[PDB]
Design an enzyme around this catalytic site. Structure first.
Site, PDB file in Angstrom:
ATOM      1  N   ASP A 312       7.213   0.066  -0.813  1.00 13.64           N
ATOM      2  CA  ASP A 312       7.546  -0.412   0.517  1.00 13.64           C
ATOM      3  C   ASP A 312       7.823   0.750   1.465  1.00 13.64           C
ATOM      4  OD1 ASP A 312       7.563  -3.269   0.975  1.00 13.64           O
ATOM      5  OD2 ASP A 312       9.139  -3.431  -0.557  1.00 13.64           O
ATOM      6  N   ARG A 343      -2.379   0.917   0.076  1.00 13.79           N
ATOM      7  CA  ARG A 343      -1.311   1.331   0.989  1.00 13.79           C
ATOM      8  C   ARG A 343      -1.224   2.864   1.112  1.00 13.79           C
ATOM      9  NH1 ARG A 343       4.715  -1.129   1.916  1.00 13.79           N
ATOM     10  NH2 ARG A 343       3.981  -1.529   4.050  1.00 13.79           N
TER      11      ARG A 343
END
Ligand code: NA
Ligand code: NA
Ligand code: NA
Ligand code: NA
Ligand code: NA
Ligand code: NA
Ligand code: NA
Ligand code: NA
Ligand code: NA
Ligand code: NA
Ligand code: NA
Length: 424
Positions: A312, A343
Site C-alpha cells: 500500500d 503497482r
C-alpha cells in the site's frame, strides 16, 4: 491539473484522518447493535457520510455533532423498510456490505450509485447471498448497479469459499451470517484484513478463526460501544515522508496509530537518518504524536517482511528512497501477485519520468538515491496514492512543471498542503 512546485518551506500540524473501513464498520455495527454507540475520530469520508445516510434511511437515529457520531442501535432485526432508494455514491465497498447487512431485512430495497459505480460487477456478492435465500439482482448477469434486494426472515446459513480475495465479500457474508439461523462457514482465498472480525468481537459477537476458515453462529445480538477510530496508516506514512524530504520542514503529525506498519516504517526512517520524534504517547488509545523534520537521508534495506501493509505504501516509500543518498533495496519476502508487480511498475515509471532511478525487480525495486527531481506528465490512473505521491514529488521539483490530469482524488488534501506552505 498542474501541481504546486518548488516550495521552500513546510510547517504546521496535520492530524491523521481515521481509517475508512473501521469508520464504516462502526456505523454498521452501531446500527445493528442494541444500546447507543459513539464513534470518535471517524473519517469524514463521503463513504462514511453515505453509509450513515443509508442507515438513517432504514430508520436508524444517527447524530453528527461536534466531531462525534452517536448511533442509537436498532438491534439485529431492527432495520426498517426505506421510503427512498438507497444512495451509495461511488463506494462499491458500501453496496457489497449493506447487501449483507440487509440479508435478513424482510422488505424490498434498491441500491444505486453513480456512473463509475454502475460499471462494477456485484455478482461476487450476489452469488453467495442468493445461496442463503436472499433475492438480489442487478443489471446483466454481472449484476451491475442499481441492485434490487429483498432479504428474508428465513435466512439460511452460508457455506462458501471465495473464488477471489475480497474483504468486502467476506464482510457482507459475515453480516448476513450474523442474522442467519445456524452455522455459517466462510473460507477466504487469501488473508485479507481483520477489521470486521475484530470489530464484531469488540461489539460482543462471536466467531472462530482457523486459518482462512471463518465460522460464525447465528443469530447474534451485539452491544453498543464507544469506538475510537485509529488513524489511517497510509495517510500517516504519507505525511511522515513529506515532512522528511521537503526542504526547511517540520510537521507535527497527531493521531498516528501505533501498530506494526508505522512501527516498521519508523525504524526504516531512523535507519535512513530521519529526524523523527515520538511524543504524546497515549498508551491506552495506542496513538502518538510524531514530529518530523527535513533530513539528510541515506539508502537502506527495506524488507517488506518487516512492514505488513508495505505494498500500500510503495508509492510514498519509493519517493522516500528516491531522496536518500545511495541504494535502497525494497525486497518483498513473499511472491508478488499481479497487481503488486503492476503497482511497482507504475510507481517506477512515474518517478523515473521525474528523474528518479528506479529498477523494478522480481521481488520489489532497487532505488538509486538523492535524485534531483524534474518536471513530467503523469496520470494517476485512478490510484490516489500514486497521485498524492506525485504531489509531494512535485514540491521537490526545482524547475519544470508537473501535469497530473486524472486527479479526481477526493479530499481536503490541497488546502492542507497549502496550509503547510505558508506556516512558520
Ligand atoms: Na467521530
Ligand atoms: Na439507544
Ligand atoms: Na436481522
Ligand atoms: Na448512475
Ligand atoms: Na449501538
Ligand atoms: Na493506525
Ligand atoms: Na498507524
Ligand atoms: Na519504532
Ligand atoms: Na526506531
Ligand atoms: Na513489471
Ligand atoms: Na513553503
Amino acid at each position: 491539473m498542474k501541481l504546486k512546485t518548488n516550495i521552500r518551506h513546510l510547517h504546521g500540524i496535520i492530524r491523521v484522518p481515521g481509517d475508512s473501513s473501521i469508520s464504516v464498520l462502526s456505523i454498521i455495527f452501531g446500527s445493528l447493535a442494541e444500546g447507543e454507540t459513539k464513534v470518535y475520530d471517524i473519517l469524514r469520508g463521503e463513504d462514511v457520510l453515505s453509509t450513515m445516510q443509508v442507515f438513517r434511511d432504514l430508520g436508524v437515529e444517527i447524530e453528527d455533532k461536534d466531531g462525534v457520531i452517536t448511533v442509537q442501535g436498532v438491534g439485529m432485526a431492527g432495520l426498517k423498510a426505506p421510503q427512498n432508494a438507497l444512495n451509495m455514491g461511488n463506494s462499491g465497498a458500501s453496496i457489497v456490505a449493506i447487501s449483507g447487512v440487509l440479508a435478513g431485512a424482510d422488505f424490498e430495497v434498491e441500491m444505486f450509485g453513480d456512473d463509475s459505480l454502475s460499471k462494477r460487477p456485484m455478482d461476487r456478492v450476489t452469488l453467495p447471498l442468493k445461496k442463503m435465500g436472499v433475492s438480489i439482482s442487478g443489471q446483466t448477469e454481472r449484476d451491475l448497479p442499481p441492485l434490487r434486494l429483498k432479504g428474508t426472515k428465513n435466512l439460511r446459513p452460508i457455506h462458501y469459499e471465495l473464488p477471489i480475495a475480497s474483504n468486502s465479500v467476506k464482510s457482507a457474508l459475515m453480516f448476513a451470517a450474523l442474522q442467519a439461523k445456524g452455522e455459517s462457514v466462510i473460507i477466504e482465498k487469501e488473508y485479507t484484513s481483520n477489521h470486521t472480525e475484530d470489530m464484531l468481537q469488540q461489539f460482543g459477537g462471536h466467531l472462530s478463526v482457523d486459518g482462512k476458515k471463518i465460522t460464525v453462529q447465528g443469530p447474534q445480538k451485539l452491544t453498543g460501544q464507544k469506538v475510537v477510530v485509529p488513524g489511517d496508516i497510509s495517510s500517516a506514512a504519507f505525511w511522515l515522508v513529506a515532512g522528511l524530504i521537503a526542504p526547511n520542514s517540520r510537521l507535527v503529525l497527531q493521531n498516528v496509530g501505533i501498530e506494526e506498519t508505522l512501527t516498521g516504517i519508523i525504524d526504516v526512517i531512523r535507519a535512513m537518518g530521519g529526524k523523527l520524534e515520538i511524543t504524546e504517547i497515549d498508551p491506552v488509545a495506542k496513538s502518538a504524536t510524531l514530529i518530523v523534520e527535513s533530513s539528510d537521508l541515506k539508502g537502506t534495506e527495506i524488507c517488506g517482511a518487516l512492514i505488513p501493509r508495505l505494498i500500500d505504501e510503495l508509492p510514498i516509500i519509493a519517493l522516500l528512497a528516491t531522496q536518500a543518498q545511495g541504494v535502497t533495496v525494497i525486497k518483498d519476502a513473499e511472491e508478488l501477485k499481479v497487481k503488486e508487480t503492476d503497482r511497482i511498475q507504475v510507481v517506477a515509471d512515474a518517478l523515473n519520468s521525474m528523474g528518479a532511478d528506479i529498477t523494478p525487480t522480481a521481488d520489489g525495486m532497487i532505488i538509486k538515491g538523492k535524485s534531483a527531481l524534474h518536471g513530467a506528465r503523469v496520470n494517476t490512473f485512478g490510484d490516489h496514492r500514486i497521485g498524492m505521491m506525485t504531489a509531494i514529488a512535485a514540491l521537490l521539483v526545482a524547475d519544470g512543471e508537473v501535469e497530473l490530469d486524472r486527479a479526481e482524488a477526493i479530499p481536503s488534501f490541497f488546502d492542507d498542503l497549502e496550509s503547510l506552505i505558508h506556516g512558520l
